[PDB]
From a paper:
Here we present a structural and functional characterization of [name] rhodopsin II ([name]), a representative of the second group of viral rhodopsins. Examination of the crystal structure, functional characterization and molecular dynamics (MD) simulations suggest that [name] is a pentameric light-gated channel that is functionally analogous to well-studied pentameric ligand-gated ion channels playing crucial roles in many cellular processes.
The crystals diffracted up to 1.9 Å, and the structure of [name] was solved at 1.9 Å. [name] asymmetric unit cell contains five molecules of the protein organized in a pentamer with a bottle-like pore in the centre that has a narrow neck in the cytoplasmic part. Similarly to other microbial rhodopsins, each protomer of [name] is organized as a bundle of seven transmembrane helices (A−G) connected by relatively short loops. [name] consists of only 211 amino acids and is the smallest among microbial rhodopsins with known crystal structure. Thus, the following amino acids play the key role in the formation of the pentamer: Glu26, Arg36, His37, Asn40, Trp203, and these amino acids are highly conserved within group II of viral rhodopsins, but not in other rhodopsins. Deeper into the pore, oxygen atoms of Leu28 main chain coordinate five water molecules forming a pentagon stabilized by hydrogen bonds with the mean distance between two neighboring molecules of 2.6 ± 0.2 Å (mean ± s.e.m., for different pentamer molecules). In [name], the putative proton donor Glu42 is located in helix B (which corresponds to Thr46 in bR) and thus juxtaposed to the RSB.
Author numbering:
A (entry chain E): 1 to 212
B (entry chain A), D (entry chain B), E (entry chain D): 2 to 211
C (entry chain C): 3 to 211
């Protein structure tokens, strides 16, 4: 419907407020400093993404779908590095109970990440063909997730986390190719999973809320 | 009419109250299990408060029907958190540990979203309103049957179960009514189901009442 | 003029009171004091919200409408204020913030009887004189019940007395025309919410000799 | 006009700074007396920042005389808090306990409000400005006489007492000026009397300066 | 065209990020010297975010020269905090105590305000643009000479000193450029000088990198 399109913006916006609140409160109370650092970063992701969604929502009346998708890049440029830092710190917490990563390794991750995003952007503004942007983008994505895989030690949380990021982030590249309207809706739903459900997972995991 | 406006403000203002009370106690309780429950409760008030502020802001720009359709977005976010709180509280009251089996929680959510989804489909004409009611209440039955299996008897658990049972059933009753009185009813139900329940959790864990 | 200033004075004092109780609620090592200051913070939060609304409207709305709107604020703040009062009595008498729920429900019943009958009088469903008479009957029940929970001591007596007088004065100002009644209620809120809030903070913080 | 615009924004932004720094430290200091002082200082910034945001929002329909009259509502709230901070600071500097006699503080407030009240009556013409100045300054003297009696000799106490005496006296001096320079002067005095004093307390108790 | 507007949003949103991260760690670190640094860092993000929200508000009908003039108010508040952080950071890295001589800090501020003030006179045409450039950079030299004397050698201090040196000098470079490129340059420099520096402090004290 016209309804469900607008609803997708609100759903993600409100779930970002939920995720931001839950990680904020636990970041302020966890006794584990490494968990605090992860939950602190996670709060920042929700804060930033919520800001951009509030902008999008403020423009719904005369919505320009293409404009919105281009604006998302500003959000992505800020949140993707934070999300990736969280991922690699979490790998290490799961292995050694300390949040640490080599800065050099992290800069290589970011290089691949920004190659991926920058290529996507060049395609959207027509500096390169969209088709080329897609393939070159996915190549950088491959470099990103290969490098990520080298920092991962095998265990249930690390495998789920890696697998979730792999699939969710790949789907951005899939939705990239769609028309502006369905692309927006897909991205809204992907953000709900990649930011909010991931954040809620981190909280629930460290809080030991669930028995498997 | 005027009823609509006052009832919106009442619930909105009480959500601020509930959110503040649970936030402060989440940050200061020495019991981590209570923190998790009160943290979740704070999320509920934050999300609902956002929706109420939006409804109030748009009151002269949207109709009663649209507001009721929009509530589903709020419900889609708040109902799962509320149910998580419920089942976590069940265990906290028994063992002082906030845990539930993820599989049990996913079954709870399945029933919850069948309830909400079939209600929504009836509301938008995809199925007959009356089927919305029947299927909704059938899923409601599944939901509370499953909740009951995780309820262990004690005073608090029984009160909580009963309160949820009655309040949540009443949403299905007000679903029957015309758009205006339905809005007012939902406003008041939210006051009870989110705000007064949230204050109960606070007061219960704070040992405010004998 | 000073009718608009009175709105700002109370609004700004609510911000002060809310800030002061918030920070101390978050730092006190006494859990009972935390519960009381937590509730006090809520009172300031809610009343501040309604005052920001009244202020946003001073051009667009008549003074009767503002007074009727206050009942929504009152319906929320009064039960929290009463809960604080009985918990404070209890803290003085037992070092613990507790009350019997049944006792609190009786208190709330009297309170809403009082507010409800007052409201009915304000909107003309019953006469103003009947609103006052029934209102004060419920007021009497309320303050009678409150007194049965009160043990004698400096703080409990000061508190009980403060509430008794300040709350009776709402019923006094109820008799006035709409404009002075607004100024009156603004000043009473400053006392009943803000100065009481500040009292609790100062008392538990042992700021004064 | 520009001068007064820029000076509004300067003080407003510095109030945000001061409120943030005292807020965070009030929440973490292990000294309860310092907490009370920093809590109070936070309130001062919150209130004054509210009023400055108001002045700023009024700029496009600005009435300089109106701004100066509105300041009295701010002063009526912030001055008692500032004075309470001052006398508690005196005591902390000697016994490390934030306490004062209620009766002493009520006398302080009596003088403070005589001062503000008579100044106000002069501004709105109930009495002549000159009579406002004379009464105002007499109340100022009573206030600072009483303040001085609660003051123990001490490096911090002396700097504080002197800073307050001078800065507060200057409000009475700018009261005499035409509305424009009066506003700019008040904006800068507020910067010193609220913000710089607030940052002093933080820095002093945090021991960041040798 | 897009990139210019985007540069405001990037820095604004990164300020929100930096403010959040230092706020949470300020409230939880067990080292109070680190708290004081992170407290100050939070203030910087709060103040700059306020001004960036203002600029973003003005993008439709944007006057590039006005914005750059407006920035001086931001600068007048944030630069002294940033310099305080820098010198406390020097000491914390060497002694693990956040302390500086007040006299040293006032000399630093003298130079800092000489730099900003002369730069401002150049912009508003009271002195020629190349003059402001030359004199401003003289004060900058004084500032960074003095800072260097407070610096003791080590990895973090050398990095911090070099980053501040280069970034702050670059404000002087972009000062020569036309209003539009100058805005974009300042937006990016603020990202580095406030946000990336603040994130560095957080990461450094949290020891998340090796
Ligand atoms: C909605 C998305 C939230 C998904 C979160 C559900 C996964 C939680 C889990 O697997 O439990 C981890 C425990 O073993 C840790 O003690
Ligand atoms: C992107 C923002 C730039 C942040 C740069 C972060 C570098 C922090 C670092 O060098 O680690 C310090 C170690 O010695 C462990 O404490
Ligand atoms: C919260 C926002 C997130 C996690 C955004 C992630 C964005 C991507 C993973 C984009 C990926 C792309 C490709 C893999 C191909 C090229 C086009 C892109 C940039 C959409
Ligand atoms: C805070 C909001 C809450 C707790 C909403 C709960 C909503 C329901 C329990 C809705 C129930 C319904 C039925 C039981 C029948 C079908 C129609 C519904 C969805 C209104
Ligand atoms: C913060 C607001 C407060 C404490 C409001 C209290 C309001 C009352 C005590 C009203 C009392 C009334 C009567 C005692 C008689 C009838 C009229 C009323 C409702 C104003
Ligand atoms: C934050 C605001 C402050 C500290 C305001 C203080 C105001 C005064 C000290 C005003 C003093 C006056 C006199 C001493 C003479 C009469 C006129 C007054 C009210 C301006
Ligand atoms: C967050 C904002 C910051 C760190 C601003 C710093 C501003 C400067 C370092 C300005 C320097 C200038 C000169 C060195 C000479 C030319 C004029 C100035 C003021 C732009
Ligand atoms: C609206 C964004 C969600 C709020 C959750 C974060 C809690 C506040 C932290 C400060 C962020 C600014
Ligand atoms: C040894 C470090 C190598 C870093 C290479 C990639 C750096 C690019 C960082 C991304 C910025 C866009
Ligand atoms: C690398 C992602 C490109 C999208 C544009 C980001 C905006 C940068 C502002 C300068
Ligand atoms: C070995 C485990 C592999 C699991 C892959 C799962 C991919 C599912 C993608 C859905 C994302 C759900 C979000 C969960 C947050 C973690
Ligand atoms: C007319 C609008 C059509 C919108 C099509 C987009 C549908 C939503 C995309 C679903 C993505 C879900 C990803 C979850 C995987 C785990
Ligand atoms: C509009 C507020 C409704 C809920 C109040 C929640 C209390 C604060 C939540 C923390 C966010 C920072
Ligand atoms: C126990 C197996 C898990 C049951 C899956 C049901 C989850 C449905 C959630 C609906 C969301 C739309
Ligand atoms: C196990 C129960 C599954 C319920 C299906 C209903 C899901 C509705 C999705 C919207
Ligand atoms: C001890 C209480 C447990 C009761 C759980 C049973 C829930 C049944 C709810 C009634 C089902 C409604 C079916 C109506 C069809 C339309
Ligand atoms: C006390 C001195 C200030 C007088 C004027 C400002 C306060 C106005 C409050 C309105 C009175 C009710
Ligand atoms: C909206 C809930 C915010 C909780 C913090 C309370 C701070 C008190 C300020 C009250 C005045 C607004
Ligand atoms: C045993 C006494 C319990 C009496 C309950 C009081 C009924 C009044 C309820 C009013 C709440 C609105
Ligand atoms: C025995 C206690 C009786 C107190 C309850 C009084 C009920 C008053 C009605 C208020 C509802 C409006
Ligand atoms: C709690 C102190 C704040 C209220 C101010 C007092 C005004 C009401 C008069 C109280 C009467 C006391 C009883 C002796
Ligand atoms: C009506 C005049 C009263 C003025 C008293 C002034 C007292 C100042 C203290 C010396
Ligand atoms: C207490 C620090 C506040 C700084 C403000 C300085 C304003 C100058 C006041 C001069 C008084 C000096 C003491 C004699
Ligand atoms: C065009 C308006 C110009 C009038 C400027 C008058 C402002 C005087 C500056 C205030 C100085 C007081 C600060 C003293 C600190 C000790
Ligand atoms: C609520 C006290 C101020 C702390 C702010 C912490 C979050 C950073 C704010 C950046 C501005 C957006
Ligand atoms: C637009 C005017 C900016 C001039 C730059 C120099 C700033 C001097 C004023 C200092 C005010 C802040 C006091 C700390
Ligand atoms: C104008 C320049 C002022 C003088 C700058 C002195 C530089 C001191 C040595 C710096 C060492 C750099 C390490 C990074
Ligand atoms: C851009 C021109 C700068 C000339 C002055 C250099 C002196 C500063 C020393 C470093
Ligand atoms: C980044 C290196 C640290 C600063 C060293 C000082 C550089 C002096 C250059 C001044 C003239 C160009
Ligand atoms: C050695 C200085 C080189 C300047 C690099 C500028 C990048 C700043 C990053 C912030 C880290 C502090
Ligand atoms: C108009 C173009 C001006 C660009 C200024 C470049 C500085 C930022 C580089 C990234």
């Amino acid at each position: 419907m016209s309804d469900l399109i607008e609803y997708s913006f609100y759903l993600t916006y409100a779930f970002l407020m939920t995720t931001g609140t839950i990680t904020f409160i636990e970041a302020l109370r966890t006794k584990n400093e490494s968990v605090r650092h992860i939950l602190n970063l996670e709060t920042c992701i929700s804060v930033v993404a919520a800001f951009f969604y509030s902008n999008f929502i403020g423009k719904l009346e005369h919505i320009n779908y293409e404009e919105i998708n281009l604006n998302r890049y500003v959000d992505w440029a800020i949140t993707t590095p934070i999300m990736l830092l969280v991922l690699v710190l979490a790998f290490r917490v799961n292995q050694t109970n300390k949040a640490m990563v080599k800065f050099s390794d992290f800069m290589i991750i970011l290089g691949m990440n920004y190659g991926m995003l920058g290529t996507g952007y060049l395609g959207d503004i027509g500096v390169i063909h969209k088709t080329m942007g897609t393939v070159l983008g996915f190549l950088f994505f491959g470099g990103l997730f290969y490098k990520l895989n080298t920092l991962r030690t095998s265990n249930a949380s690390n495998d789920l986390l890696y697998g979730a990021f792999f699939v969710l982030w790949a789907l951005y590249g899939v939705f990239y190719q769609m028309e502006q309207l369905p692309r927006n809706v897909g991205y809204n739903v992907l953000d709900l999973f990649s930011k909010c459900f991931v954040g809620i997972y981190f909280w629930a995991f460290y809080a030991k809320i669930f028995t498997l």
